[PDB]
Amino acid sequence: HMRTNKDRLVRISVVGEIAPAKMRSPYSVTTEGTVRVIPVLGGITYNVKVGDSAYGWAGDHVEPGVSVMARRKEEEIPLMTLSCIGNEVIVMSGDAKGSRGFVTGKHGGVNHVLVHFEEEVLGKLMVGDKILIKAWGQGLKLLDHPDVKVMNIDPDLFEKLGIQEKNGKIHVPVVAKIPAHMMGSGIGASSSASTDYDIMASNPEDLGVADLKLGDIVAIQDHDNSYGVGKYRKGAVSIGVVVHSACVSAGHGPGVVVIMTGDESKILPEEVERANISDYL
Template identity: 55%
Template structure:
């Protein structure tokens, strides 16, 4: 097992409310110039969950499970910064009080934290129900690989990813590899420690060529030639690893969202494709 500073990490409470979907204008314009009216972000999404296909839904930026945030901007910033994929979440108000789930992603722009709960618990929830998260993971480091930045992932989930060492490199099980030129909305952000950025899916032939038409929510993917250490930027030979957190989109420059969990400017991270490289498999959900 890789040596980390897990025993030094601080676990801290953060909390948010289930956020109602919002709309100020009914139409979303596709990259082909088509006006569409579609479900999008927020609320409780009952029939879309981690492990399901991320492509093909009659929706835009669909967030699986429960979407939470805070009205106070600073508090919402803390929720989005400190929450990590794999953190334990607990409903602390409403009819589903006591239900347990897991953080599955962080969606930039709308600044939502996404949480998985069982179907029977979703049926008991309401908008504005409060969800407490045991935030744990920011500050995680690899003792023998200080050049690798780790972010946005619970240490216990990180330990389940099956990362191996080989000839001074880290071999990460992945579901797919993404070329740098397909990364769109969110590229250029000053930090990757919250939110996500999107794989552009407007070219069907390229998406099929890389097998990205088969992506599922929760898949671990490798992004080639992108450094996410201090913002999201192109850097030849850099490698970033992330998790698919929201669905495909119709808007230009958008597509399935990726929350980063690892990044390095040096080419020491390699991916090996396998059938079960998805957080649903590692979390048993």
């Protein structure tokens, strides 16, 4: 139990609706300059869920579970900014009205918040159904570690990640440690609070692991995410969550939402067999 400002934090209604499956072209362009016709992002994805492999799908940018978009452009920034991984989500219209889930991730660009509901719910949902996220976590501070920034994470979920304070150093279980040069699309976004960015590994063996799963906790080496996304800084480290599937185009791959950032003197990622948010929700 780290000391935080949890009691100072503001909890607020963030609304959206279930997003349709989205495609701007039938074709996805590969790194080899070839075209494939495959499903992409958005929608209710019936057979890909948090906890599944990010790899091995005939798809691109596939978002697990339910994708939630804004009612209109003006409402995209708060949706994307305030929604934190692990926040409670309630279905507010349609046949699954009253059903509860949790935020697994968010994806910038199209600006989707990604949500896990129990399987039985998914078959009752419809594109356009109203969604309430009870947004809570931005503003979170570690009072004993002011140089370690945290974000994008529900404070109750934060306490279940196996993070231990030992000797003024913050030990964090991770499945993999990713070099700065493996990060691609999304570097330079205005705020790490409001988007993911991509690990451009075409295969999980490129990251030194047999598999990378949606919901996995990873370390990003030599990236500072305190403000904008993806600042290369030797000795910086970031901790994040894997939020979407593998991708076919140059510079893309499984998305990561940052939950912690600071110096390698303070944050010690420790490689374990399993570290996945699906285990706690």
